[PDB]
Design a protein around this nucleic acid. Sequence first.
RNA 1: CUGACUGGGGCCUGUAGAGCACUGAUAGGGCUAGGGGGCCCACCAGCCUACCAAACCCUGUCAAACUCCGAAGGGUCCCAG
RNA 2: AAGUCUGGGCUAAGUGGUAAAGGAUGUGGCGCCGCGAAGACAGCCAGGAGGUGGCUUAGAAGCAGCCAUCCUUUAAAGAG
RNA 3: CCUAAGGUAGCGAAAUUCCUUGUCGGGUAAGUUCCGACCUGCACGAAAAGCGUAACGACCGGAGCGCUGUCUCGGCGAGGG
RNA 4: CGCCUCCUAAAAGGUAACGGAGGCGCCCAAAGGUCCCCUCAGGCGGGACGGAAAUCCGCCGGAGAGCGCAAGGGUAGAAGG
RNA 5: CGAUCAACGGAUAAAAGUUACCCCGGGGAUAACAGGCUGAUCUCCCCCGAGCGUCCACAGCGGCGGGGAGGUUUGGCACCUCGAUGUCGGCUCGUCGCAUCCUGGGGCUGAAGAAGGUCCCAAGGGUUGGGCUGUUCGCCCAUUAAAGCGGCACGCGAGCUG
RNA 6: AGCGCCGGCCAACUCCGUGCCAGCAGCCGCGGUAAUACGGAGGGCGCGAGCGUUACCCGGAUUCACUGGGCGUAAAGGGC
RNA 7: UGAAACUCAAAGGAAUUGACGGGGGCCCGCACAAGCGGUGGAGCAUGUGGUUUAAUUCGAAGCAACGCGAAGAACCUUACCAGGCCUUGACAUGCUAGGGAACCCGGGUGAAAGCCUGGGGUGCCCCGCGAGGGGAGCCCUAGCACAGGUGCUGCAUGGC
RNA 8: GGCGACACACGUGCUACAAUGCCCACUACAAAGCGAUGCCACCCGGCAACGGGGAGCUAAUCGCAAAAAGGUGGGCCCAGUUCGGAUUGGGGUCUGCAACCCGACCCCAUGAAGCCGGAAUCGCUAGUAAUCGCGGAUCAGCCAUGCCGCGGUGAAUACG
RNA 9: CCGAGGGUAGGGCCCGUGACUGGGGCGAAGUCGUAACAAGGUAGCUGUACCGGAAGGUGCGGCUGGAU
RNA 10: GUAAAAUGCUAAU
RNA 11: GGCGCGUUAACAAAGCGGUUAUGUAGCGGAUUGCAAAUCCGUCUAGUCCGGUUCGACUCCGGAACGCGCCUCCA
Length: 249
Amino acid sequence: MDERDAIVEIRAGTGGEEAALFARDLFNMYLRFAEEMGFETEVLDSHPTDLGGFSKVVFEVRGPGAYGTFKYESGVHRVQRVPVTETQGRIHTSTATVAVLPKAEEEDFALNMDEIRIDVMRASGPGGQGVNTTDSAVRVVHLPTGIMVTCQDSRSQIKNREKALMILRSRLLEMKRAEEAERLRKTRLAQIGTGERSEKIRTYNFPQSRVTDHRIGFTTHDLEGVLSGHLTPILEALKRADQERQLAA
RNA sequence: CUGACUGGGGCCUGUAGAGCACUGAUAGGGCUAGGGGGCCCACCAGCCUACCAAACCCUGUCAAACUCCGAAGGGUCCCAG
RNA sequence: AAGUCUGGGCUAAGUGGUAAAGGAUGUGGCGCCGCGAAGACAGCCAGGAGGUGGCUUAGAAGCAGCCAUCCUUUAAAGAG
RNA sequence: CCUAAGGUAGCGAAAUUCCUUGUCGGGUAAGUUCCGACCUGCACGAAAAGCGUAACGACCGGAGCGCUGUCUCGGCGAGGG
RNA sequence: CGCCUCCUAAAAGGUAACGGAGGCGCCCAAAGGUCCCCUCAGGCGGGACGGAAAUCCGCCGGAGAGCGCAAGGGUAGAAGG
RNA sequence: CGAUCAACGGAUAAAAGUUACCCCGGGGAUAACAGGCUGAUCUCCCCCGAGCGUCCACAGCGGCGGGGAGGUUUGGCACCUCGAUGUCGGCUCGUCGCAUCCUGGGGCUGAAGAAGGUCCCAAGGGUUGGGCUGUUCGCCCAUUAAAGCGGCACGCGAGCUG
RNA sequence: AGCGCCGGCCAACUCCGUGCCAGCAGCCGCGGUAAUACGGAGGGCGCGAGCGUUACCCGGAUUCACUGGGCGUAAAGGGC
RNA sequence: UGAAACUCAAAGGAAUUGACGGGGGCCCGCACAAGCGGUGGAGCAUGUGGUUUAAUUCGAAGCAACGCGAAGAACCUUACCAGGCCUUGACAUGCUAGGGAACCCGGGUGAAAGCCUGGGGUGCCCCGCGAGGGGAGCCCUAGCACAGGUGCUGCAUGGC
RNA sequence: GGCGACACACGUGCUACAAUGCCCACUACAAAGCGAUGCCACCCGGCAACGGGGAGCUAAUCGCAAAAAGGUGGGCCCAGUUCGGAUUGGGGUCUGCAACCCGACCCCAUGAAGCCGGAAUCGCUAGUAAUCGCGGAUCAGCCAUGCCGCGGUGAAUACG
RNA sequence: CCGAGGGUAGGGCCCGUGACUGGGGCGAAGUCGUAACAAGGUAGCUGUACCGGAAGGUGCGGCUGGAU
RNA sequence: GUAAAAUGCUAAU
RNA sequence: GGCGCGUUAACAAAGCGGUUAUGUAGCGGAUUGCAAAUCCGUCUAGUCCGGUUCGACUCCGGAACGCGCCUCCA
Ligand SMILES: [K+]
Ligand SMILES: [Mg+2]
Ligand SMILES: [Mg+2]
Ligand SMILES: [Mg+2]
Ligand SMILES: [Mg+2]
Ligand SMILES: [Mg+2]
Ligand SMILES: [Mg+2]
Ligand SMILES: [Mg+2]
Ligand SMILES: [Mg+2]
Ligand SMILES: [Mg+2]
Ligand SMILES: [Mg+2]
Ligand SMILES: [Mg+2]
Ligand SMILES: [Mg+2]
Ligand SMILES: [Mg+2]
Ligand SMILES: [Mg+2]
Ligand SMILES: [Mg+2]
Ligand SMILES: [Mg+2]
Ligand SMILES: [Mg+2]
Ligand SMILES: [Mg+2]
Ligand SMILES: [Mg+2]
Ligand SMILES: [Mg+2]
Ligand SMILES: [Mg+2]
Ligand SMILES: [Mg+2]
Ligand SMILES: [Mg+2]
Ligand SMILES: [Mg+2]
Ligand SMILES: [Mg+2]
Ligand SMILES: [Mg+2]
Ligand SMILES: [Mg+2]
Ligand SMILES: [Mg+2]
Ligand SMILES: [Mg+2]
Ligand SMILES: [Mg+2]
Ligand SMILES: [Mg+2]
Ligand SMILES: [Mg+2]
Ligand SMILES: [Mg+2]
Ligand SMILES: [Mg+2]
Ligand SMILES: [Mg+2]
Ligand SMILES: [Mg+2]
Ligand SMILES: [Mg+2]
Ligand SMILES: [Mg+2]
Ligand SMILES: [Mg+2]
Ligand SMILES: [Mg+2]
Ligand SMILES: [Mg+2]
Ligand SMILES: [Mg+2]
Ligand SMILES: [Mg+2]
Ligand SMILES: [Mg+2]
Ligand SMILES: [Mg+2]
Ligand SMILES: [Mg+2]
Ligand SMILES: [Mg+2]
Ligand SMILES: [Mg+2]
Ligand SMILES: [Mg+2]
Ligand SMILES: [Mg+2]
Ligand SMILES: [Mg+2]
Ligand SMILES: [Mg+2]
Ligand SMILES: [Mg+2]
Ligand SMILES: [Mg+2]
Ligand SMILES: [Mg+2]
Ligand SMILES: [Mg+2]
Ligand SMILES: [Mg+2]
Ligand SMILES: [Mg+2]
Ligand SMILES: [Mg+2]
Ligand SMILES: [Mg+2]
Ligand SMILES: [Mg+2]
Ligand SMILES: [Mg+2]
Ligand SMILES: [Mg+2]
Ligand SMILES: [Mg+2]
Ligand SMILES: [Mg+2]
Ligand SMILES: [Mg+2]
Ligand SMILES: [Mg+2]
Ligand SMILES: [Mg+2]
Ligand SMILES: [Mg+2]
Ligand SMILES: [Mg+2]
Ligand SMILES: [Mg+2]
Ligand SMILES: [Mg+2]
Ligand SMILES: [Mg+2]
Ligand SMILES: [Mg+2]
Ligand SMILES: [Mg+2]
Ligand SMILES: [Mg+2]
Ligand SMILES: [Mg+2]
Ligand SMILES: [Mg+2]
Ligand SMILES: [Mg+2]
Ligand SMILES: [Mg+2]
Ligand SMILES: [Mg+2]
Ligand SMILES: [Mg+2]
Ligand SMILES: [Mg+2]
Ligand SMILES: [Mg+2]
Ligand SMILES: [Mg+2]
Ligand SMILES: [Mg+2]
Ligand SMILES: [Mg+2]
Ligand SMILES: [Mg+2]
Ligand SMILES: [Mg+2]
Ligand SMILES: [Mg+2]
Ligand SMILES: [Mg+2]
Ligand SMILES: [Mg+2]
Ligand SMILES: [Mg+2]
Ligand SMILES: [Mg+2]
Ligand SMILES: [Mg+2]
Ligand SMILES: [Mg+2]
Ligand SMILES: [Mg+2]
Ligand SMILES: [Mg+2]
Ligand SMILES: [Mg+2]
Ligand SMILES: [Mg+2]
Ligand SMILES: [Mg+2]
Ligand SMILES: [Mg+2]
Ligand SMILES: [Mg+2]
Ligand SMILES: [Mg+2]
Ligand SMILES: [Mg+2]
Ligand SMILES: [Mg+2]
Ligand SMILES: [Mg+2]
Ligand SMILES: [Mg+2]
Ligand SMILES: [Mg+2]
Ligand SMILES: [Mg+2]
Ligand SMILES: [Mg+2]
Ligand SMILES: [Mg+2]
Ligand SMILES: [Mg+2]
Ligand SMILES: [Mg+2]
Ligand SMILES: [Mg+2]
Ligand SMILES: [Mg+2]
Ligand SMILES: [Mg+2]
Ligand SMILES: [Mg+2]
Ligand SMILES: [Mg+2]
Ligand SMILES: [Mg+2]
Ligand SMILES: [Mg+2]
Ligand SMILES: [Mg+2]
Ligand SMILES: [Mg+2]
Ligand SMILES: [Mg+2]
Ligand SMILES: [Mg+2]
Ligand SMILES: [Mg+2]
Ligand SMILES: [Mg+2]
Ligand SMILES: [Mg+2]
Ligand SMILES: [Mg+2]
Ligand SMILES: [Mg+2]
Ligand SMILES: [Mg+2]
Ligand SMILES: [Mg+2]
Ligand SMILES: [Mg+2]
Ligand SMILES: [Mg+2]
Ligand SMILES: [Mg+2]
Ligand SMILES: [Mg+2]
Ligand SMILES: [Mg+2]
Ligand SMILES: [Mg+2]
Ligand SMILES: [Mg+2]
Ligand SMILES: [Mg+2]
Ligand SMILES: [Mg+2]
Ligand SMILES: [Mg+2]
Ligand SMILES: [Mg+2]
Ligand SMILES: [Mg+2]
Ligand SMILES: [Mg+2]
Ligand SMILES: [Mg+2]
Ligand SMILES: [Mg+2]
Ligand SMILES: [Mg+2]
Ligand SMILES: [Mg+2]
Ligand SMILES: [Mg+2]
Ligand SMILES: [Mg+2]
Ligand SMILES: [Mg+2]
Ligand SMILES: [Mg+2]
Ligand SMILES: [Mg+2]
Ligand SMILES: [Mg+2]
Ligand SMILES: [Mg+2]
Ligand SMILES: [Mg+2]
Ligand SMILES: [Mg+2]
Ligand SMILES: [Mg+2]
Ligand SMILES: [Mg+2]
Ligand SMILES: [Mg+2]
Ligand SMILES: [Mg+2]
Ligand SMILES: [Mg+2]
Ligand SMILES: [Mg+2]
Ligand SMILES: [Mg+2]
Ligand SMILES: [Mg+2]
Ligand SMILES: [Mg+2]
Ligand SMILES: [Mg+2]
Ligand SMILES: [Mg+2]
Ligand SMILES: [Mg+2]
Ligand SMILES: [Mg+2]
Ligand SMILES: [Mg+2]
Ligand SMILES: [Mg+2]
Ligand SMILES: [Mg+2]
Ligand SMILES: [Mg+2]
Ligand SMILES: [Mg+2]
Ligand SMILES: [Mg+2]
Ligand SMILES: [Mg+2]
Ligand SMILES: [Mg+2]
Ligand SMILES: [Mg+2]
Ligand SMILES: [Mg+2]
Ligand SMILES: [Mg+2]
Ligand SMILES: [Mg+2]
Ligand SMILES: [Mg+2]
Ligand SMILES: [Mg+2]
Ligand SMILES: [Mg+2]
Ligand SMILES: [Mg+2]
Ligand SMILES: [Mg+2]
Ligand SMILES: [Mg+2]
Ligand SMILES: [Mg+2]
Ligand SMILES: [Mg+2]
Ligand SMILES: [Mg+2]
Ligand SMILES: [Mg+2]
Ligand SMILES: [Mg+2]
Ligand SMILES: [Mg+2]
Ligand SMILES: [Mg+2]
Ligand SMILES: [Mg+2]
Ligand SMILES: [Mg+2]
Ligand SMILES: [Mg+2]
Ligand SMILES: [Mg+2]
Ligand SMILES: [Mg+2]
Ligand SMILES: [Mg+2]
Ligand SMILES: [Mg+2]
Ligand SMILES: [Mg+2]
Ligand SMILES: [Mg+2]
Ligand SMILES: [Mg+2]
Ligand SMILES: [Mg+2]
Ligand SMILES: [Mg+2]
Ligand SMILES: [Mg+2]
Ligand SMILES: [Mg+2]
Ligand SMILES: [Mg+2]
Ligand SMILES: [Mg+2]
Ligand SMILES: [Mg+2]
Ligand SMILES: [Mg+2]
Ligand SMILES: [Mg+2]
Ligand SMILES: [Mg+2]
Ligand SMILES: [Mg+2]
Ligand SMILES: [Mg+2]
Ligand SMILES: [Mg+2]
Ligand SMILES: [Mg+2]
Ligand SMILES: [Mg+2]
Ligand SMILES: [Mg+2]
Ligand SMILES: [Mg+2]
Ligand SMILES: [Mg+2]
């Protein structure tokens, strides 16, 4: 878990163009934090706002022990400043939603053909003397799930058996990569959620030069150094209160 | 009387078998280009390697279109039955 | 139709009279060392102990997993 | 990028759908057929017309009620053989 | 689908399969005749630009180069320059 | 001198398709059905023992490889049949095999009991009714001791259906 | 002796805490680091064995207008 | 002909003062036009963004931030970093305890800071020819109130 | 020690890219200021930066001081040059307790990019723009080519 | 005879519920454009018609609640 | 009958 | 399975035996209060393996992946 390379998905929340600009400043905060750990960040998918921001940034943190630290940052982050997008000198609250996921496996598929049963029969339709006599039709019934692929496409049984297994595997994989996406989906809705001004994990209020992790109460005042990548104290101050979640009896 | 077949005599041949000298393949070891890694330096290079490995060498092998070799036979001419 | 013919041996499976990897105190014939009255082998009679576990592990402590397997009364007792 | 130009309305697993008994819903104790939907239409589509449509049909589907020797499962009797 | 080279082809010749591999449908006025000279590839060392390889010098080197183009045979005591 | 007369011994100077509306002469010299040979594929059984099973290779399993049996699948071949060997499924009627679905007898069990797992013996008997589809097959409903798998020209059209 | 209330309506105010969070809310609205509007305290206002809230009826609503309204441009003259 | 659910705390009419118009009219400004020299390319200077940095102190941000604060950064400046000292502290005063100093010339020891050392001499009155004892600038250590902060809010502010 | 960093990018400027110019020697004409550990005459050592002397001036008196463009004479002849002066090497001067990062000036050698600058873009309407030198403040020395001043020479054009 | 009710068959109205489907209200931020408010950069609005991702456009006729 | 090159700018009194 | 075609950078898509393809993007600049539009500039290349050639993205032979077509008579 904590020792696998981990991928952080930075998005934009409420705020419009300034949410995407604050998300750009969270992007160069965990990337400058990367070399402050000897880690490796590879870009994967960015949607650059023409104003210099990102509506969505996805990067990796390739290093032995990334999900042991980045994991806390998953959640909604709050901003409140006078944006460069504002022209009446007013404070504007905006959000930028972060998601931290572990880089999973690209593991391949293969059929355990002891839980696979192959039925054979005569083919339904034309063919004359052949179709009435030849066992050209194949049904592969995946046993632990019940689903069945049939194939009487050609006249050959061994051709219609690969076309049946090929589709049995191709269909079983699209169901395996389906809960893989359902897990991937419900998990974000725990991290990101609605991304509204509430639900916040950390406020970066530029007026007061303060960065506050409201879930534990730790607040520093180095809002420039924190945004420059010195998030090590906030992670530690959550780390001590992380095992002070294990205080038993 | 020249025949099939047969005796002797010469010449032609590249298979069976075997071999590795050529063309390729080939396990391992030795030796040793270049690369990988490599304590480290880029001021300048060195040194390590139970790491992939060129070539060369040893041990050990493979081949219809490989042969330094090479039968038994086969063919043909001459004399004779 | 012609030997229930003669001499030597093997098989006990009706093998002969339908097949493979492999498996086996089936049976016979050759061997090669070994151990034996310095009493062998088999059986029985005993001793097979002890500092007693070193790691695992709240026991696994002579009989889970790991480390090499130190030594005494001795004819021999393996931290098994 | 290519084309002469890139399928409009309407309809769609269809007298059209390969995968296919697609998926969902209805009906059944149970429905590869049926009806209603959905639309990645293998391979609808606008006078080889498109989508509807009262009435009509010895056309071809699906369901129910009634009633039965069709059947469970056969029995007997009649006449022509 | 005709023609050439190798193999299959069982050491003369020949020998089949929708057997295994390749090539030809050109070209050269010199790439032809003759006379006269000359000898390679590759390895080491050395040498401005100049490198693995341009040209130059030494030593070793029988033919592994070259012979317009496939392959085989042939070949420096030349068929090669 | 004019040839991709390249189908390269070169029919004409000059030439493409379709037939389920079809026809005649021939062929089991040659395909589709069934049989036969074969057994790659198919089904079943073994060998080896890496590993699994808290512990323990073998209760139950068996990596990577190895050996067979059968003749139900799909094929390969083209040997009788093209002067005809009627083809799927259903119905009806059975009979056989046993690699056994149930019932009878066992051993092992990671078998307390009950109930199962696994292997061995056993072919006497038995092995239901329905929805869907032409279906074989399969799925589903309600039951069952059980709802076996195969051969017989994928048994049976001079027995029926179509 | 308790209950409601003290931003305006509407009578009754200061302190810390919080920092668009927690929360108040009948309407207008409060809260994003000096909140008489949130939570506590002190103080205050109103009633009193009660105080508040919820539901419903009439009023305020001349907002169905008989009393006692309107219809050029606010809703409202019928196309003639 | 003609609803309801749900939803909003408004939807509206006229008119007022503004602002605005790719409306109008009338004026003006090196605003264009008319000219003259430049900048944009080069090398250096300087300020700044950015990256780097142990720190590269901070403010300034279109015009109206950018040779601007800064009309003089090697130390100083200096607000930043590193390391070594500091402890009523550099400084203000007032409250005490021991001294009783004041101030001035050396020794170490460290990079200096700083920490440990070694000398002398104090007024005001007195009892005073007395030992010398007090009051008493200022000085030091044990405590005191309290200092100090270029640490933050120019979205609490004056002043400029 | 940093504020002075350097893959880059922007603003503000200096110096340029030549002959209406560069060079050298000689001869002119300002204004505003400033100056008692201050300005410095003049003399001499030093190619120089400077040094050692050393008057005069609390300063319309003494000095900074040379103004420079300008003028006379002579030269370089159209070239990355007698244009341009960056970069680097070596030798020194001074300030300052102290000059490595990181100062300024002098001398010798080096002699860069740059041939008048794409899209684009700034100033200036008369003693103005252009061009030329001088002074001041801050200041130990200075990275000032900056700021505020100061005089010298001195245009073109406004139809609208 | 009538007759509670039971039964059979066909009607009507109401309620809830339904694969899927139509748009509507709402939302401190999303994607595309910019139709209307200035002559809003093609004066606007209108009924109807045809068309287009979308606001809309265009045709015919009307209104001024348009302009200088 | 006058009369136009040119789109956009979220969200806190 | 048979036959034909194809693989180029960020995307899409071309020519070619020896050599800035091209459009849009992306990067630096200009313009703008800012952004788009626009204007000045600028940039990343040929799926793997083996042949041919002096030289291969380009030619030949294979693999891999994608497209298209065919798979009929029983
Ligand atoms: K036919
Ligand atoms: Mg996105
Ligand atoms: Mg704004
Ligand atoms: Mg099976
Ligand atoms: Mg069939
Ligand atoms: Mg059918
Ligand atoms: Mg047919
Ligand atoms: Mg068949
Ligand atoms: Mg004779
Ligand atoms: Mg003869
Ligand atoms: Mg002979
Ligand atoms: Mg022989
Ligand atoms: Mg041999
Ligand atoms: Mg060899
Ligand atoms: Mg051999
Ligand atoms: Mg051999
Ligand atoms: Mg041979
Ligand atoms: Mg020999
Ligand atoms: Mg002979
Ligand atoms: Mg002979
Ligand atoms: Mg003779
Ligand atoms: Mg006998
Ligand atoms: Mg005898
Ligand atoms: Mg037996
Ligand atoms: Mg027998
Ligand atoms: Mg037998
Ligand atoms: Mg179509
Ligand atoms: Mg159309
Ligand atoms: Mg239409
Ligand atoms: Mg449609
Ligand atoms: Mg459909
Ligand atoms: Mg269906
Ligand atoms: Mg249809
Ligand atoms: Mg169709
Ligand atoms: Mg179908
Ligand atoms: Mg079908
Ligand atoms: Mg179904
Ligand atoms: Mg259904
Ligand atoms: Mg149903
Ligand atoms: Mg019903
Ligand atoms: Mg039916
Ligand atoms: Mg339907
Ligand atoms: Mg679909
Ligand atoms: Mg049609
Ligand atoms: Mg059609
Ligand atoms: Mg037609
Ligand atoms: Mg048709
Ligand atoms: Mg037509
Ligand atoms: Mg129809
Ligand atoms: Mg009809
Ligand atoms: Mg009708
Ligand atoms: Mg009808
Ligand atoms: Mg009819
Ligand atoms: Mg009819
Ligand atoms: Mg009729
Ligand atoms: Mg019926
Ligand atoms: Mg019925
Ligand atoms: Mg019925
Ligand atoms: Mg009957
Ligand atoms: Mg029946
Ligand atoms: Mg009868
Ligand atoms: Mg009768
Ligand atoms: Mg021929
Ligand atoms: Mg020929
Ligand atoms: Mg031969
Ligand atoms: Mg031969
Ligand atoms: Mg021979
Ligand atoms: Mg011959
Ligand atoms: Mg042949
Ligand atoms: Mg023959
Ligand atoms: Mg070939
Ligand atoms: Mg060929
Ligand atoms: Mg020749
Ligand atoms: Mg000659
Ligand atoms: Mg050499
Ligand atoms: Mg060389
Ligand atoms: Mg040769
Ligand atoms: Mg050649
Ligand atoms: Mg060739
Ligand atoms: Mg031809
Ligand atoms: Mg021919
Ligand atoms: Mg012909
Ligand atoms: Mg002819
Ligand atoms: Mg002719
Ligand atoms: Mg012809
Ligand atoms: Mg014909
Ligand atoms: Mg037909
Ligand atoms: Mg027909
Ligand atoms: Mg007819
Ligand atoms: Mg006919
Ligand atoms: Mg006829
Ligand atoms: Mg016929
Ligand atoms: Mg016939
Ligand atoms: Mg005939
Ligand atoms: Mg015949
Ligand atoms: Mg024939
Ligand atoms: Mg046949
Ligand atoms: Mg057949
Ligand atoms: Mg067949
Ligand atoms: Mg037949
Ligand atoms: Mg057959
Ligand atoms: Mg037969
Ligand atoms: Mg077999
Ligand atoms: Mg067999
Ligand atoms: Mg087999
Ligand atoms: Mg077996
Ligand atoms: Mg185990
Ligand atoms: Mg065990
Ligand atoms: Mg296995
Ligand atoms: Mg085998
Ligand atoms: Mg076998
Ligand atoms: Mg059989
Ligand atoms: Mg059979
Ligand atoms: Mg047999
Ligand atoms: Mg066949
Ligand atoms: Mg067969
Ligand atoms: Mg035959
Ligand atoms: Mg046949
Ligand atoms: Mg034959
Ligand atoms: Mg026949
Ligand atoms: Mg007959
Ligand atoms: Mg007959
Ligand atoms: Mg007959
Ligand atoms: Mg048995
Ligand atoms: Mg049993
Ligand atoms: Mg039993
Ligand atoms: Mg039991
Ligand atoms: Mg039990
Ligand atoms: Mg049992
Ligand atoms: Mg057993
Ligand atoms: Mg039985
Ligand atoms: Mg039914
Ligand atoms: Mg049925
Ligand atoms: Mg069925
Ligand atoms: Mg089926
Ligand atoms: Mg039972
Ligand atoms: Mg059962
Ligand atoms: Mg059944
Ligand atoms: Mg049977
Ligand atoms: Mg048959
Ligand atoms: Mg049959
Ligand atoms: Mg059957
Ligand atoms: Mg039959
Ligand atoms: Mg029949
Ligand atoms: Mg039948
Ligand atoms: Mg029959
Ligand atoms: Mg018959
Ligand atoms: Mg019969
Ligand atoms: Mg018969
Ligand atoms: Mg029919
Ligand atoms: Mg109250
Ligand atoms: Mg009240
Ligand atoms: Mg009040
Ligand atoms: Mg309250
Ligand atoms: Mg209330
Ligand atoms: Mg806030
Ligand atoms: Mg406030
Ligand atoms: Mg407060
Ligand atoms: Mg409130
Ligand atoms: Mg209140
Ligand atoms: Mg309160
Ligand atoms: Mg009242
Ligand atoms: Mg009232
Ligand atoms: Mg009323
Ligand atoms: Mg009321
Ligand atoms: Mg009234
Ligand atoms: Mg009214
Ligand atoms: Mg109205
Ligand atoms: Mg009227
Ligand atoms: Mg009206
Ligand atoms: Mg109004
Ligand atoms: Mg101008
Ligand atoms: Mg210029
Ligand atoms: Mg310029
Ligand atoms: Mg620039
Ligand atoms: Mg510049
Ligand atoms: Mg500075
Ligand atoms: Mg910076
Ligand atoms: Mg400064
Ligand atoms: Mg300073
Ligand atoms: Mg400092
Ligand atoms: Mg500020
Ligand atoms: Mg102020
Ligand atoms: Mg400057
Ligand atoms: Mg500049
Ligand atoms: Mg001065
Ligand atoms: Mg001066
Ligand atoms: Mg030069
Ligand atoms: Mg040049
Ligand atoms: Mg020069
Ligand atoms: Mg120097
Ligand atoms: Mg320095
Ligand atoms: Mg020039
Ligand atoms: Mg003026
Ligand atoms: Mg000048
Ligand atoms: Mg000056
Ligand atoms: Mg100075
Ligand atoms: Mg009645
Ligand atoms: Mg009734
Ligand atoms: Mg309803
Ligand atoms: Mg608009
Ligand atoms: Mg419009
Ligand atoms: Mg506009
Ligand atoms: Mg417009
Ligand atoms: Mg318009
Ligand atoms: Mg209209
Ligand atoms: Mg239109
Ligand atoms: Mg217009
Ligand atoms: Mg314009
Ligand atoms: Mg536009
Ligand atoms: Mg937009
Ligand atoms: Mg605009
Ligand atoms: Mg918008
Ligand atoms: Mg290409
Ligand atoms: Mg591409
Ligand atoms: Mg193109
Ligand atoms: Mg082409
Ligand atoms: Mg280019
Ligand atoms: Mg390009
Ligand atoms: Mg750009
Ligand atoms: Mg811009
Ligand atoms: Mg190549
Ligand atoms: Mg090559
Ligand atoms: Mg290729
Ligand atoms: Mg046909």
